[model samples]
Target chain A: KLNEIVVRKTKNVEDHVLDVIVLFNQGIDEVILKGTGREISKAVDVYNSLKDRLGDGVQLVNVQTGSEVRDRRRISYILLRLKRVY
Target chain B: TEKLNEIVVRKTKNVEDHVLDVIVLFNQGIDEVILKGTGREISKAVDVYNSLKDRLGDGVQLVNVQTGSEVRDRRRISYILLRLKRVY
Candidate 1:
């Protein structure tokens, strides 16, 4: 209904995991989870958690990640894209 | 024709993710995993090759490597392909 959403990692790994599950439960076919630096690892943790929790409910369609530069610093980032394997 | 197709490495791909793909294919018992890329992405392909060889141990072999350079749009693209044969 509302135009999709950006699932950015905040608080901790579990919290983000819950947010992602919310989207999935709402019948979101594809979701994009984004994070940077230390949060990148947390994003991946959430991805695995979703995979185990969702089982055959969902599938990882693609993953996008690389290092980015901002100002004078470099940050590693990741975007996990998942779909309902129906 | 080649026995099987190869996995194309994306520029923004995480090396570990590529390794995971290769590993899964290895478990399924593939004849080879070919890493092909051009320009700067050839670096990432190399990383995947090294990581797979390390993780897969002697189960892998360098069956082929091809490289060619072409200039386009003022950029030199060194098209490279590495074939790691025998996932048995």
Candidate 2:
């Protein structure tokens, strides 16, 4: 299960997408992008970027959203499914 | 910290939930909405603020964008306080 596979945004837009991309491209089964509240934009952005770049042979198993806690606050988050190759 | 009247803008799901909440309060004569968001989501909060303006129309008025620096971490955030211009 790629539960903790979420990508959290840091720095600017370029920086946001790169972390997940780098990790996925290097080696990984799946990369999940987790975002909450306003931060959900990052997850959405990265998903779009990968879908376009990952292209024909790429695989996305599923996507889901949930409300979860990060410390004391409960926030909504999303997970993006990206499986590397066959 | 203390939300005088606030809503944290998050996810596609909560945007309209928040809008309706604001309207419900406005109907009850609530003066303000503290729309809050951190990082890029700060922009999302801005969208929420605009959405309220659009949904409420002339009945609602944007007071001002509140300011700050950090919140749950080291970062920048955005929020706005809104109120109706009149009871009309």
* Model 1 interface root-mean-square deviation: 13.0
DockQ (C-alpha based) per candidate is: 0.02, 0.08
Best by DockQ: 2
User: Candidate 2 on B1-88: residue-level lDDT in tens?
Assistant: 6847766666665667877776777777776656666546654564555566666667666554443334455543323232323236
The candidate 2 chain B region of ten consecutive residues with least summed lDDT is B77-86
Q: Given the true complex, what DockQ would model 1 score?
A: 0.02
Write the residue-wise lDDT of candidate 1 on A1-86 in tens digits: 24223345447656776776777777777778775654544555566667667878877665554456778875555566778665
Q: Model 1: per-residue lDDT, tens digit, B43-76?
A: 5666676667667778787676554455668964
RMSD of 2: 12.3
The 10-residue segment of model 1 chain B with minimum total lDDT is B37-46
Pull out the clashing pairs in model 2. Answer: A6-A32, A37-B10, A38-B41
